[PDB]
Amino acid sequence: MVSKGEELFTGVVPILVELDGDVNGHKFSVSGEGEGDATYGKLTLKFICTTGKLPVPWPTLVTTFVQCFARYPDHMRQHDFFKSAMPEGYVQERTIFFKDDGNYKTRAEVKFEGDTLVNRIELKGIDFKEDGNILGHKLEYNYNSHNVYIMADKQKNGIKVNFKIRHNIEDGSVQLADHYQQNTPIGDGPVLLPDNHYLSYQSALSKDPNEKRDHMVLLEFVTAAGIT
Ligand SMILES: [Cl-]
């Protein structure tokens, strides 16, 4: 049978993202909108900085900016925590360590509000260098493909996730961002606790030629794998 969580994702779902951020005291807000099509693992989103100029590079926020839209193969359906927690939702927490620089800590609440999948995020960044690659804006506007590794965390009725992102720096080098993540259901109901597996991401960043506000257009495809 198809679960109630699965059923919510069988079509195209509107997405709303709202973030409040503070990185080394630079305060900013971002709003995002678009659509997710989980059957195809497809995300299409546009983000706008509503407070003026974004004080960090847009690529550093890509991972923060709805893993319930991942395409899970039929044979791996019993391993899809994210959809199983819906519609009541889940809280995602991350620490993201930028090598030789500062760190972000994020808390995101992801749930349905009517037909819209909403993610409300608070991001706090500290210990950044004033002329490091982040606050000095030295990162290229592009994105590499990566795998995201998932395991159950029974004691929390959720999952633990870890992965490394390599951001290309303008001089040809790379800025590593080590991600540690936990997700916990908001409701008290049963969720699917997965066997170890991963999600494969591909991402493309672009600009809306008619948009004068600071913004990012993101197209992402996400597929679960590792169990066959
Ligand atoms: Cl940027």
UniProtKB/Swiss-Prot annotation:
It holds the Pfam family GFP. Changing F65L: In EGFP; increases fluorescence at warmer temperatures such as 37 degrees Celsius. In EBFP; gives rise to variants with blue fluorescence. The keyword rRNA processing does not apply. Changing V148I: In Azurite; shifts the excitation and emission spectra to shorter wavelengths and increases quantum yields compared to BFP. Changing M151T: Increases fluorescence at warmer temperatures such as 37 degrees Celsius. Photocytes. Monomer. Energy-transfer acceptor. Its role is to transduce the blue chemiluminescence of the protein aequorin into green fluorescent light by energy transfer. Fluoresces in vivo upon receiving energy from the Ca(2+)-activated photoprotein aequorin. This is Green fluorescent protein. It comes from Aequorea victoria. The gene is GFP.
